[PDB]
Amino acid sequence: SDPSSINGGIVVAMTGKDCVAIACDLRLGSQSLGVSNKFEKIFHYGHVFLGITGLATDVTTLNEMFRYKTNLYKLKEERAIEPETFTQLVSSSLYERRFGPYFVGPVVAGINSKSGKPFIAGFDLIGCIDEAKDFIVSGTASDQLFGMCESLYEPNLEPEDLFETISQALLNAADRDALSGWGAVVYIIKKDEVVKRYLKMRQD
Amino acid sequence: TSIMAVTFKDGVILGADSRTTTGAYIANRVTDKLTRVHDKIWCCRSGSAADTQAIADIVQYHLELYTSQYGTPSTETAASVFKELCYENKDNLTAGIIVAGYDDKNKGEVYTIPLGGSVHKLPYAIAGSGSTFIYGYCDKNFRENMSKEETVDFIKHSLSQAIKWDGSSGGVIRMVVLTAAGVERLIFYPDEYEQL
Amino acid sequence: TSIMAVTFKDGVILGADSRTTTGAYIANRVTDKLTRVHDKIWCCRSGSAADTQAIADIVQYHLELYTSQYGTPSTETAASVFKELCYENKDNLTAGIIVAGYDDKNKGEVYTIPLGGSVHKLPYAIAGSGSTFIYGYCDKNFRENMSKEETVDFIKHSLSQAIKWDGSSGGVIRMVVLTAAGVERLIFYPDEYEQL
Amino acid sequence: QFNPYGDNGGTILGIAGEDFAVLAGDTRNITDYSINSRYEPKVFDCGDNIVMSANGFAADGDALVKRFKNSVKWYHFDHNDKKLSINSAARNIQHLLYSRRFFPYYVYNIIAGLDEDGKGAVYSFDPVGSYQREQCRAGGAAASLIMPFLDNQVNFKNQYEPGTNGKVKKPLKYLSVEEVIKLVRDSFTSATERHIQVGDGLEILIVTKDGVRKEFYELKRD
Amino acid sequence: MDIILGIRVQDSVILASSKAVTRGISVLKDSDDKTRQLSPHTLMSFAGEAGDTVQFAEYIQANIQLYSIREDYELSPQAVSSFVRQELAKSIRSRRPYQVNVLIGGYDKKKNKPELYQIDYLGTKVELPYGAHGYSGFYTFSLLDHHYRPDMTTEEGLDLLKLCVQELEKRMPMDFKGVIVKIVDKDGIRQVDDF
Amino acid sequence: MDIILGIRVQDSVILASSKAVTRGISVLKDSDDKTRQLSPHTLMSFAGEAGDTVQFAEYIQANIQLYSIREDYELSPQAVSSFVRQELAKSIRSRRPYQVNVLIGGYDKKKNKPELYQIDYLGTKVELPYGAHGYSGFYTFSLLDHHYRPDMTTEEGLDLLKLCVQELEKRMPMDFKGVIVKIVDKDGIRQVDDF
Amino acid sequence: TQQPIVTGTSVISMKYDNGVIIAADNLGSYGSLLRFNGVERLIPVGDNTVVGISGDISDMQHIERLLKDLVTENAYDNPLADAEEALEPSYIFEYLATVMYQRRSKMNPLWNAIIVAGVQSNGDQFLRYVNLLGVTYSSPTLATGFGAHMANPLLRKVVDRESDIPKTTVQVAEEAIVNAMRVLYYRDARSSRNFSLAIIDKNTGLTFKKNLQVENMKWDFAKDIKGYGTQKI
Amino acid sequence: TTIVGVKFNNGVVIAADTRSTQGPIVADKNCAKLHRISPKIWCAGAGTAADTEAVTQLIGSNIELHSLYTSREPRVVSALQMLKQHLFKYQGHIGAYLIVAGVDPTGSHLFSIHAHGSTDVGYYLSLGSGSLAAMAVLESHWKQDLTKEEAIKLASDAIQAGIWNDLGSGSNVDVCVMEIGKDAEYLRNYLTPNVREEKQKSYKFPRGTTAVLKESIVNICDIQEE
Amino acid sequence: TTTLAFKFQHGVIAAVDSRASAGSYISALRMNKVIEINPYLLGTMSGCAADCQYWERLLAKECRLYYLRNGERISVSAASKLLSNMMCQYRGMGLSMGSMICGWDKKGPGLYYVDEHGTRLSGNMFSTGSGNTYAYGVLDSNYKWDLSVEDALYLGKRSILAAAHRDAYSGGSVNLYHVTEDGWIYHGNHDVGELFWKVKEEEGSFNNVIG
Ligand SMILES: *[C@@]([C])([C][O])[C@](*)(=O)[C]([C]C1=[C][C]=[C][C]=[C]1)[N]C(=O)[C]([C]C1=[C][N]C2=C1[C]=[C][C]=[C]2)[N]C(=O)[C]([C])[N]C(=O)C1=C([C])C2=C([C]1)[C]=[C][C]=[C]2
Numbered sequence A: 001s002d003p004s005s006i007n008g009g010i011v012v013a014m015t016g017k018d019c020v021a022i023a024c025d026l027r028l029g030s031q032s033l034g035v036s037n038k039f040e041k042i043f044h045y046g047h048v049f050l051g052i053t054g055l056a057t058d059v060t061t062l063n064e065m066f067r068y069k070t071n072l073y074k075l076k077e078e079r080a081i082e083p084e085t086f087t088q089l090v091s092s093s094l095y096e097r098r099f100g101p102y103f104v105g106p107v108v109a110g111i112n113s114k115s116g117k118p119f120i121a122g123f124d125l126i127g128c129i130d131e132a133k134d135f136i137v138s139g140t141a142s143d144q145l146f147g148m149c150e151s152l153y154e155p156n157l158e159p160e161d162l163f164e165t166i167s168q169a170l171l172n173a174a175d176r177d178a179l180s181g182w183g184a185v186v187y188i189i190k191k192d193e194v195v196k197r198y199l200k201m202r203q204d
Numbered sequence B, C: 001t002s003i004m005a006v007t008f009k010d011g012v013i014l015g016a017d018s019r020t021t022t023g024a025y026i027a028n029r030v031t032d033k034l035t036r037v038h039d040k041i042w043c044c045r046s047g048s049a050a051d052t053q054a055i056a057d058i059v060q061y062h063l064e065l066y067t068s069q070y071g072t073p074s075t076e077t078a079a080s081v082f083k084e085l086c087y088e089n090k091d092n093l094t095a096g097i098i099v100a101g102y103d104d105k106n107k108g109e110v111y112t113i114p115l116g117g118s119v120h121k122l123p124y125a126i127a128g129s130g131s132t133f134i135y136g137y138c139d140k141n142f143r144e145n146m147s148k149e150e151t152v153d154f155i156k157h158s159l160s161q162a163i164k165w166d167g168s169s170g171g172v173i174r175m176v177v178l179t180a181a182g183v184e185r186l187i188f189y190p191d192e193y194e195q196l
Numbered sequence D: 001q002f003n004p005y006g007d008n009g010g011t012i013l014g015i016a017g018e019d020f021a022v023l024a025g026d027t028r029n030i031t032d033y034s035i036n037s038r039y040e041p042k043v044f045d046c047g048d049n050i051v052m053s054a055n056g057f058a059a060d061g062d063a064l065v066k067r068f069k070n071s072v073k074w075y076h077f078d079h080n081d082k083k084l085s086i087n088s089a090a091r092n093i094q095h096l097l098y099s100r101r102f103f104p105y106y107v108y109n110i111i112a113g114l115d116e117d118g119k120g121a122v123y124s125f126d127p128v129g130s131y132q133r134e135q136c137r138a139g140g141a142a143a144s145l146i147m148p149f150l151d152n153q154v155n156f157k158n159q160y161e162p163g164t165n166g167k168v169k170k171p172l173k174y175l176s177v178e179e180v181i182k183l184v185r186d187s188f189t190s191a192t193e194r195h196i197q198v199g200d201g202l203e204i205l206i207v208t209k210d211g212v213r214k215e216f217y218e219l220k221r222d
Numbered sequence E, F: 001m002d003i004i005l006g007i008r009v010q011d012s013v014i015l016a017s018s019k020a021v022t023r024g025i026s027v028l029k030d031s032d033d034k035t036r037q038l039s040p041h042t043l044m045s046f047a048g049e050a051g052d053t054v055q056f057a058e059y060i061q062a063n064i065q066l067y068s069i070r071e072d073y074e075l076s077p078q079a080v081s082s083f084v085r086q087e088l089a090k091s092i093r094s095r096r097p098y099q100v101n102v103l104i105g106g107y108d109k110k111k112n113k114p115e116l117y118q119i120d121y122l123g124t125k126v127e128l129p130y131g132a133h134g135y136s137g138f139y140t141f142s143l144l145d146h147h148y149r150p151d152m153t154t155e156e157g158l159d160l161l162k163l164c165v166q167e168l169e170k171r172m173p174m175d176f177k178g179v180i181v182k183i184v185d186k187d188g189i190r191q192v193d194d195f
Numbered sequence G: 001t002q003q004p005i006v007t008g009t010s011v012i013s014m015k016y017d018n019g020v021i022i023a024a025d026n027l028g029s030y031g032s033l034l035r036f037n038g039v040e041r042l043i044p045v046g047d048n049t050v051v052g053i054s055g056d057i058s059d060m061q062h063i064e065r066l067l068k069d070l071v072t073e074n075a076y077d078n079p080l081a082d083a084e085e086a087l088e089p090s091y092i093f094e095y096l097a098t099v100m101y102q103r104r105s106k107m108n109p110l111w112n113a114i115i116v117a118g119v120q121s122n123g124d125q126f127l128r129y130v131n132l133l134g135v136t137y138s139s140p141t142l143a144t145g146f147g148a149h150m151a152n153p154l155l156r157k158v159v160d161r162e163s164d165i166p167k168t169t170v171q172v173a174e175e176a177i178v179n180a181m182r183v184l185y186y187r188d189a190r191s192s193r194n195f196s197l198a199i200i201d202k203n204t205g206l207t208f209k210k211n212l213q214v215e216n217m218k219w220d221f222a223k224d225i226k227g228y229g230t231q232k233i
Numbered sequence H: 001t002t003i004v005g006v007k008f009n010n011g012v013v014i015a016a017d018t019r020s021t022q023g024p025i026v027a028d029k030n031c032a033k034l035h036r037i038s039p040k041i042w043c044a045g046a047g048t049a050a051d052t053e054a055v056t057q058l059i060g061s062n063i064e065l066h067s068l069y070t071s072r073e074p075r076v077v078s079a080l081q082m083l084k085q086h087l088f089k090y091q092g093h094i095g096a097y098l099i100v101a102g103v104d105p106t107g108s109h110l111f112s113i114h115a116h117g118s119t120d121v122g123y124y125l126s127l128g129s130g131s132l133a134a135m136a137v138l139e140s141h142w143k144q145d146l147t148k149e150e151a152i153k154l155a156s157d158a159i160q161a162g163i164w165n166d167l168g169s170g171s172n173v174d175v176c177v178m179e180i181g182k183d184a185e186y187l188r189n190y191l192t193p194n195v196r197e198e199k200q201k202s203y204k205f206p207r208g209t210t211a212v213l214k215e216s217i218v219n220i221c222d223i224q225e226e
Numbered sequence I: 001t002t003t004l005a006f007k008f009q010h011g012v013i014a015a016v017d018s019r020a021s022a023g024s025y026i027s028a029l030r031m032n033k034v035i036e037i038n039p040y041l042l043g044t045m046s047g048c049a050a051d052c053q054y055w056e057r058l059l060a061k062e063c064r065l066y067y068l069r070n071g072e073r074i075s076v077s078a079a080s081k082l083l084s085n086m087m088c089q090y091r092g093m094g095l096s097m098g099s100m101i102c103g104w105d106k107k108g109p110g111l112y113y114v115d116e117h118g119t120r121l122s123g124n125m126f127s128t129g130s131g132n133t134y135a136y137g138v139l140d141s142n143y144k145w146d147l148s149v150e151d152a153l154y155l156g157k158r159s160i161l162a163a164a165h166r167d168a169y170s171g172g173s174v175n176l177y178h179v180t181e182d183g184w185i186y187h188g189n190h191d192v193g194e195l196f197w198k199v200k201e202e203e204g205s206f207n208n209v210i211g
C-alpha cells in the first residue's frame, strides 16, 4: 500500500578526494515478489548523476523528465548542466507537484567541471534539499545505510578506497532489507573518467 | 441545572432551580433538586437524574444505618459516602453533587463532589450547567459570615442570573436553610426573581 | 480569549486580555486583540487568529477604499462588511468579532458578530471563551450613560473575573477608548487587576 | 482511550567472544521528544554470571528483569544452590514472556554469559518469547543501524580475500575483548549521531570466568 | 481478468492468456481472447478490472494503427511499450485510473530479435525473458527460473509453457478455463489452435 | 470447504463432496474426504469454516458411536439428524459458534427407506429428496428439479449426479478438484472409486 | 479505562548538595476552567519524604489516603517506627510504583504522574519519577507535564550531571526552582500564581512552605506591542 | 528544530540549530535553517522543510521584484503580509512556521508566522519542537534595552537549551545579526559544541575485499569528431 | 518463510529456510525452523516464531509423556492430533502457526500438515510459508516416489532455493533433514548465497541472473 515501499530499492552516494561515488541495488519487486534483477536506478545527464528510489513508475517517469529538461538546457545554454544547478532543478520540479507528489527519494552526484569540487545532494519526495558533505542515502534500507555509512565513512578517500567503502555500506545494508538486493552497481566518478562496477552479492 | 450551597454565620443554605429537560423539552418545571440524606444534611444534585437519585438513596440508607449504630454523622462523613460511590463507580456514573449540612460543633459546612469523585471543602459551591454564567458574580459578591437575609439574597440574585442565561435552568428557586433552629424550606417564584 | 466593548456617555471603550494559546501552551502572553479597521472604528477578535486577521485586513482594505470614494464610513457600515465576509464564508471560518466605533452623529456604537455571521447591535457586548463566566456580573453591573472612569472600572473588573476563571484568558488587560477627543490606549497589569 | 504501552527509546548490543561476552546499552531514557534521564541503567547483573537487558517499554522491561532475578533466586532455593546455566535461563525467560502472549511485555530482551563449556554466549528474544542463541545482536531503537555493521565487522560478511576476487571468503578469526569493545563504542558513537533516542552515556558489562565487570563511556548529549 | 503469461525464446515471443470471464458467481464465457494486435509484429495481452481492459487495449490499438498509417512504418516493440507505459503513468494520477496490466510481445524486424515487455497499471515497465501479472508469477516463475534458456526453440518454449499452465491448474484455486496461446515471430502473429 | 451434494433415490442415498483444500492462494490437497461415518448406515458430509468442520464432525461421530455402544443399537437417521441440529442450534448462540453446514445421508433399516437431511450452521433442518449447501444449489437444483424421480435406481442417481458435477465444473469459477461419491443403502456405506 | 476530570499541572524538583527540593502549584483545573484554587499537591510522608502528584485529583486524593494508611500500617507492632524502621522514600516510591504498574496492567490506571522526593537513612538523596504507565526513572532534576519541557532545561543548567550536585547549595537550588515556577506561570495556561515548596535536607530536616506567590514578573514591555504586524496605533 | 528571534537596542538577531530529521533519524547534521528573503530580511523555519524553503524563495523573489519596481529597500511588513496571505490561501496545507526578522528604513522588526496565516509581534520569540526549552531561557534572561552582544548571547543560549533538551534539535548554532545602518552579518556555525569524537578504529578496507562481476567504462563525453 | 516436506520410498525429506522478518527489516539470517521432538519426529515452523517455538516444544513435552506412560513411541498421527487440539483451545485468539509433523512409525513414514485453525491433513507432500508457491512449482514437476536419497535431498534443497530467490521474506540458509526408520538425519546448513551460484553453474538454471 505504501508507495515508497512497494517496489523496494536503495541508493547511496559518497564524496572522496577529487571524486564521488554513487551506488544502487538492482531489485524491482511487487511487495514480496521479485520481478527484475536488472532495474538500474542511477541515470546520468552529461556528467551529473541521478539516483532515484521509491515508486518505480515515478523513477522511470522522472528520468525521462530530467532527460527532457537537461537536453533543452544544453541546447539553450550551449553547455552541460552542473550538479548544483541540476539539484535546484530537481527540487523545483518536485515541489511543483506539492499536493500530488512523485513518491521518490532522489540523490544527485557529480563533480563541477569548472571548480572541480565534488558534490552530492539528497531530497525528500517533495523537494527539500539535503546538501551533505559526507554521504547521502535513500530507499527502503535508508536506516541500515545511515548506520553503515556513519561508521565506515572517513573523509578524503581515494577512488579505489572509496569504492570498497561504498560497496560494503550498500551490500551489508541490502542484506538486512527484504526489499533491496538482487544485484548492485557502483559508479566511481572522477573529473574526466567514470567507471561502473557490478557487484557480486547474494541473490535472495 | 443551577445549584449552589452557601455557608453563613448561623449555618448553611442550599439553593436550586426546578427545571428538568429532555433535550429542549422541559419534562418537569417544578423539580425538587434539594434532597435530604439526613435531618440536617442535604445535597444538591446535578448530572444524570437516575444516577444522582440512586446515589442519594444509597447514601440515605448508609447514614440511617450509621445513626442507628454510632449516632448523628458529620457532614464530612456524609460527603465521604457520596465520594466513595462517585469515585469507585466513576466509569458508569455522571453525577455532580454538592453536600451541605449543619453540626453544632462544626456549624455549616459545604462539600462539592464533581464528576471524577474528588472532594473539595469550600465556604460556598456552585454547580450545574448554569453555574458557568455566575462564577464571576458569585466570586465578587460572596462574603464570609453573612446574615441569613444576606445569604438568601446572594443565592436568589445568583440563581436568578444562572436561570436568565442557561436554558437548562429555570422555574422556581428552591432553598433549604440549615441552622440550630431547625430546617426551613423557601421558595421564590419567577415574578419575584426575574425583576432583580 | 476574553473581549468586550461597552458604550458610555462620551463614546465607546473596547477591552481585551492578551493571551493566545496553542492547547495549554501560551504561544503569546502579550497579544494585541484590539485591532483597528479605521481611525475610530476598532474590533475585538475571537476564534481562529488566522481567520480573524485575514478578515480584519480585508475589512480595513474595504473601509480605506470606501473612505477614498465616499468619506468616513459609519460603524454600522463597518459591521456590515464584517458580516458579509463572516456570513458568506461561514463554512470555512471560525470567527467571533465585536465591532465598536465612534461617530459625532451616532456617537458610540457596538455590534457583535458571532459564528454564524448574524449581526446584533447592543449597548455592550462580551465574547470569547472567558465571556461565559461574566454574563451574570456584566448584566448586573452595566448601566447606560456611564462616565469614562466608571466604564473603565466596569471593563477592568469584568475582564479580571474572566481571566480569573478562564485558562485561555490572561496576561494584561488592553483597552481602547473611542471619543470625540480622539483615541486613547490603556493597559492594566496583573498586579493591578488581580487584587480587585 | 488509555494506551498501556509506551516507548522509552534506548538501544542495546550483545557480542559473544571465544571465552567472554559483552552486553552494552545506552543510559538515556526518553518519552517522545523529551529526555527523562541521561543516566538510567538498562543492563543488569542478574546473578550466576548472567547479564540481562530488556529494551523498549521500560515499565515492562523493569518488570521482566525483576521477575527473572526472582526466578534465579527461587532456582537456588528449589535446586540446592545449583548454578543456573545460560541455556536454562534463556528457556526460563521464554516462558516468562509467553505468559503474556495476549498482553505482551513490549521489550526486546538480550542476555549474555558463558555456556557450560566456558565459551561466550548471547541469547536473543522477541517480545512474545521466541529465542535463539547468537554470536552477535543489536536490539532497540537503532538496531537496524548497528546489526549490518556487526554482520560486516564481526562475521566478515561480504568480505573476501584480495587477489582471489570473490572466490575465497575472509576467514572467521575470533575477536578479543579489546577488539570487541572498540566495535561496541564505535557502534554506539555512530548510532548516537544518526538516532535521536540514542546518546548521553554508554554502559558495558563484560562477562568472564572471573566475574562481571563494568565499563562506562560518555556519549553526545544532544 | 485472471492469468496472462509471456515468454521470449530464441526467435519468437509466446503469450498465453486465460479464456474465462466471470460476472457474479457465473462464468459467462470460456473462450475469451484477452489480446489485441497492435501491429503486424506486435501483440498485447491484458488483465485487470472489468471493462477497463478492453477499452484501454482498443484505445492503444487505435493509436498505434494511426501511427502506422501516418508514417507508413511499424513502430518498434520498444517504442510501443514506452507509449503504453506513458499512457498508464498518465492514467494512474487521473480522476478514475484505468486498472489494466499488460504484456507486450513483439518481434523487432530491425534488430531481428524477439522482445517481451511487462507493464503494470501504475506504469511500471520492465523488459524480461519471461513475465506474468497478478498471482500467476507466484506459481510459474520457479519453473521458468529453472528451465529457461535464451537459445530455446519455439517448440521448447511451448513445452515449458505447458508445464507452467499444468502447475497453475494444479495449485490455483480458481478455474481459468485453459489458455489461448499466440506466437509472435519474424513472419508475424499466429495462434496455436491446439493447446 | 466448498461443495457438498446429496440425492435420495429409491433404495439409497448418494453423497458427493469436493476434494479440494485451500490455504491462502495454494491448493494444499486434491483428495480430501469431507465426510465421517456416524454409524454403519448413516453418513455425514460437511462444509464450512476451516478446522471447525472436522472438529464438529468428529465430535458428532464420537457421540453417536458412544450411543451405539451404550444401547447396542443404531439410531435412526431422523434421530441422528435431530441430535446434530440441536448441537448446531446450541452452537449458534455460543461465544464462538461452529461454522459448519452438513448433509446427513442414512438408510433407515426399520422403515426400509433412504433418508437425506440438510442442516445449516444455524440449526436449520429439512428432509429432502436432494440437497446442497452454499452456492452449489444455485447451479444444480434446476437439473435436479427437472430430472429427479423418487423411483430412480442408484445407477440413474449417479448419472444425474454426474450431470450436476459437469454443470458445476462448467459454470463455477472455483476449481473444486472433482468429488468423492459415497452410497448409503441397506448393505451399508461404500465409496464409488471411479467418478 | 477513564479520562482525567479535575487535574493538577506540573510538579518540579531537583537535588542539591544536602538534599532535595520539590514544588507544585495549588490549582485544580476542570478542563479550561480554573475551578479550584486551594489544592495541595505536595504530600509529606513522615519527616523525610514528600510526594508530589500531577494529573487526576480524585486519583491523587486516593493515593494521599494510601500513603496515610501506609504510615499507620508501618507503626503496627513496630517499636522503631519513629527511628530505624521508619518509612524511607525508597519504600514509599516502590509501593506506589507497584500500585501504578498493577493498575495499568488491569487497564484501569491511576491517571497521575508522581515524583517522590526525600532523604534516606544514610543521608543519600532520593528523587524518582513514576506515572500511570508504571514507567520509572531517576535524574538530578525531575519534572512532570509542562515542567518537563520548560523547567528541566533551566534546572539542568544548575545540575547538568551527577558531579554538579555537591557544588549546588540550597539557596541556588531554591532560586532555580522559584524561577522555573515563574516561567511556568508565564507559559502554562493551566497553572496558577500560588504554589507550595518543600525542602528535605539531611541536616535541617523537612521545611514545608505554603502560600508562596510568583513575584518579580516582567509585563511592562507589553505596552509597546501593538497589532499583529502592520498596525502602529 | 529550535529557532529564536531577539530584539535589541539597534536591531534584531535570529538563531537556529542545525539538525534535520526524518522521524527519529538524523538526515543532516549541519542543516542551514536561516534563510534569506532579502539582504537585511532573514527568516528561519520549522515544520515541513520543503514548504519553509519554497515559501521563503517565492516571497524573496517577489520581494526583490517589488524592490526593483518601487526603487526602495524591502520592508519586513511586506514579506510578512505576502507570506501570511499565501499561507492563508492554502489553509495550513503548506506546513511553514517561520520567525521573520529584519531591518528596513522604518526600523527593526520581529514577527512570527504560523502555517494557517496568523502572525504575531514580539521582542523575543521561539518556534519548533525546542521552542519551550528556548522560551524558558528567554523568559528567564530577557530584558528591555539589550545590547548587540547580550542579545547574541541570549539567542544562542536559547538555541542551546533546545539542542541539549529537545531530541528534535541538535548539533550547531547558526546566527544572523541585523543591525540598523549596517550590513547583516550571517554567522554560520557560530557555535560548535557537538563534534564527533575520534573513532577507536579505522574501517578502511583492503583493496580487493569486495567481489566484482563486470567492469566497464562509462561514456559521459559527447559524440566525438572523425 | 518457506518450508517443505514430502514422503518418498526411503522415508521423508524436510527442508526449511532460515530467515526472519519484522516488516521489511530482516531480523534474523539464521533461524532454526525445525524442532527435533524426538529421534523419529520432526516439526517444521511457519508463522509467528514465538507461537511455533512455544507450542511445538509443548508438543514435545506431551509426546515424551506419552512414551513414559505407554513404553512406546507416539505415532505421527497422534502427535499431529495433539498439536491440532492445542490450536483448537486458542481458537480465534490470534495464534499464527503453520507446521508439518514429519516422522517414521509402525505404519511407515508419516507426514501431517497442521495450522492455527486446527486443520490436520495427511499427505505425501506439503509446503508452507510466504514462499510455498515457488517451492511447489519445483516439487510438483520433479517429485517421484522412486527418488533416491541423494536426489530427494537435492529436490528439497533446490525447492527452498527457488523460494529464497523469488520470495523477499524467504532466504538466509537451507536446513535439510532426512527421516528414516532408524531416525532423522541432519544434512547440514547451506548458505543460499553460496548455494545459488553453485546451483546456477552446475545446473545451468537461473540463466536470467548474471554471475
Ligand atoms: C518467514 C520468514 C516470514 O513469514 C517465516 O514465516 C518465519 C518463520 C519462522 C519460524 C520460526 C522461527 C523464525 C521464523 N516467520 C517470521 O519470521 C515471523 C513472520 C511474522 C512476523 N510477524 C508476524 C509473523 C507471522 C505471523 C504473524 C505475525 N516473524 C516474526 O515472528 C518476527 C516478529 N520476529 C522477529 O523479527 C524476530 C525474531 C524471530 C527474533 C527477533 C526478532 C529477535 C531475536 C530473536 C528472534
Ligand SMILES: [Mg+2]
Pocket (backbone or CB within 6 Å): A174, A175, A176, A177, A178, A179, A180, A181, A182, A204
Ligand atoms: Mg535482501
Ligand SMILES: [Mg+2]
Pocket (backbone or CB within 6 Å): A203, A204, I163, I164, I165, I166, I167, I168, I169, I170, I171
Ligand atoms: Mg528472498
Ligand SMILES: [Mg+2]
Pocket (backbone or CB within 6 Å): C053, C054, C055, C057, C058, H085
Ligand atoms: Mg486577508
Ligand SMILES: [Mg+2]
Pocket (backbone or CB within 6 Å): C163, C164, C165, C166, C167, C168, C169, C170
Ligand atoms: Mg487565566
Ligand SMILES: [Mg+2]
Pocket (backbone or CB within 6 Å): D191, D192, D193, D194, D195, D196, D197, D198, D199, D220, D222
Ligand atoms: Mg543523539
Ligand SMILES: [Mg+2]
Pocket (backbone or CB within 6 Å): A035, E118, E119, E120, E124, E125, E126
Ligand atoms: Mg510490472
